[PDB]
Amino acid sequence: SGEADCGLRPLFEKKSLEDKTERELLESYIDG
Amino acid sequence: VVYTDCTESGQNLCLCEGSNVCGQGNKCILGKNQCVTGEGTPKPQSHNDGDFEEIPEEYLQ
Amino acid sequence: IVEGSDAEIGMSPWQVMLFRKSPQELLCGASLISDRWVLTAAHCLLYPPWDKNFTENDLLVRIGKHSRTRYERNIEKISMLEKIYIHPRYNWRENLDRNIALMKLKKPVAFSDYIHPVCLPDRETAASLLQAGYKGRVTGWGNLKETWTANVGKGQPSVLQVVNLPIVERPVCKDSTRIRITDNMFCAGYKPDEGKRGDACEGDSGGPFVMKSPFNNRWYQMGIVSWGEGCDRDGKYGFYTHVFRLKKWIQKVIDQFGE
Numbered sequence: 001s002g003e004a005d006c007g008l009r010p011l012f013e014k015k016s017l018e019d020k021t022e023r024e025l026l027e028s029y030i031d032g
Numbered sequence: 033v034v035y036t037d038c039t040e041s042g043q044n045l046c047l048c049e050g051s052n053v054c055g056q057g058n059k060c061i062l063g064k065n066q067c068v069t070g071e072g073t074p075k076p077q078s079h080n081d082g083d084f085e086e087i088p089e090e091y092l093q
Numbered sequence: 094i095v096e097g098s099d100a101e102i103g104m105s106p107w108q109v110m111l112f113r114k115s116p117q118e119l120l121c122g123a124s125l126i127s128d129r130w131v132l133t134a135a136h137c138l139l140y141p142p143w144d145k146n147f148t149e150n151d152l153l154v155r156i157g158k159h160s161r162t163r164y165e166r167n168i169e170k171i172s173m174l175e176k177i178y179i180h181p182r183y184n185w186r187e188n189l190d191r192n193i194a195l196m197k198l199k200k201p202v203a204f205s206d207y208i209h210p211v212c213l214p215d216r217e218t219a220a221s222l223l224q225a226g227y228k229g230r231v232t233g234w235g236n237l238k239e240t241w242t243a244n245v246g247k248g249q250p251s252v253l254q255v256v257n258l259p260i261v262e263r264p265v266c267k268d269s270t271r272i273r274i275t276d277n278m279f280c281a282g283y284k285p286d287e288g289k290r291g292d293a294c295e296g297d298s299g300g301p302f303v304m305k306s307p308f309n310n311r312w313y314q315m316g317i318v319s320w321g322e323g324c325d326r327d328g329k330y331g332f333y334t335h336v337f338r339l340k341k342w343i344q345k346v347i348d349q350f351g352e
């Protein structure tokens with residue numbers, strides 16, 4: 001709800017590249 | 033703070049009775065182990081070493 | 094970090110190293126929340142029972158690091174502290190209540206591929222993401238085991254470590270310890286019989302427990318590595334300062350003093 005470019009990694013989100021284990025975190029929001 | 037096992041009797045701020053911290057105003061006595069009242073002494077800060085490459089000496093001033 | 098893996102380069106570019114001047118030691122982890130402000134645990138800076146009461150001139154922050162021991166020239170930045178701020182109701186005698194601290198840098202640090210700030214949560218983010226069973230990420234250069242056999246085992250990692258841990262129910266947290274758990278603490282880690290393992294350990298304190306929102310793709314710091322009874326013991330859990338719970342203090346410190 002504020003404004004400055006935080007939490008978007010230059011070598012990952014900014015390049016549309018996924019890190020090795022972030023899927024594990026995302027999946028945890030949905031179970032399985 | 034990561035509490036680790038007591039290594040000497042009279043220690044505190046360490047894990048005494050199983051995985052339980054023995055807090056201040058208590059001290060560990062090593063048996064089964066028991067943590068009881070009585071001014072204890074903090075287990076010395078679990079010390080690190082010095083294998084770091086030197087940083088520019090202007091920062092160590 | 095116990096049972097983690099080597100971070101990829103730039104994987105956690107908000108990760109900060111608190112570095113002691115003389116002797117040269119890793120003190121703690123920490124995180125970058127703006128170009129002049131770094132968030133850490135209070136016991137990193139103030140812990141009387143160990144005779145710890147650092148002033149600004151005793152420490153450095155090192156930002157953009159990957160290797161633990163290397164001076165990573167033209168990658169890391171090394172900043173001096175302007176002022177340290179400990180939460181005024183941080184309680185060290187009893188239970189590490191309100192274990193939170195901020196450091197203001199003398200100069201702003203320039204952002205790069207390796208150095209970039211994490212977000213702090215608003216209310217909707219805290220409410221959504223901070224729920225039991227959801228996983229966050231912990232990073233640090235702390236110990237790889239609680240104890241190892243001296244001069245033989247690997248003790249400190251050569252490179253920043255990363256581990257993913259599930260947030261644990263508040264009643265299970267409280268039943269795993271005799272310490273009074275408060276509002277501004279949460280706990281994380283696998284249960285025995287979940288098979289998987291992992292924990293923060295010595296030297297990881299002050300570092301960030303972060304979570305990625307699936308809806309805006311941003312990483313939020315939800316916790317600070319705060320305290321543990323051992324590392325990775327079955328039926329024990331890592332405790333973390335609940336950053337959102339204490340954000341009003343961060344606000345007070347930052348627009349009275351800095352930004």
Ligand SMILES: *[C@@H]1O[C@H](CO)[C@@H](O)[C@H](O)[C@H]1NC(C)=O
Nearest residue numbers: 139140141142145146147148
């Ligand atoms: C530690 O140093 C601070 C800041 O200089 C000082 O005000 C305070 O009295 C000291 N605190 C303790 C607990 O010794």
Ligand code: NA
Nearest residue numbers: 325326328329
């Ligand atoms: Na555990």
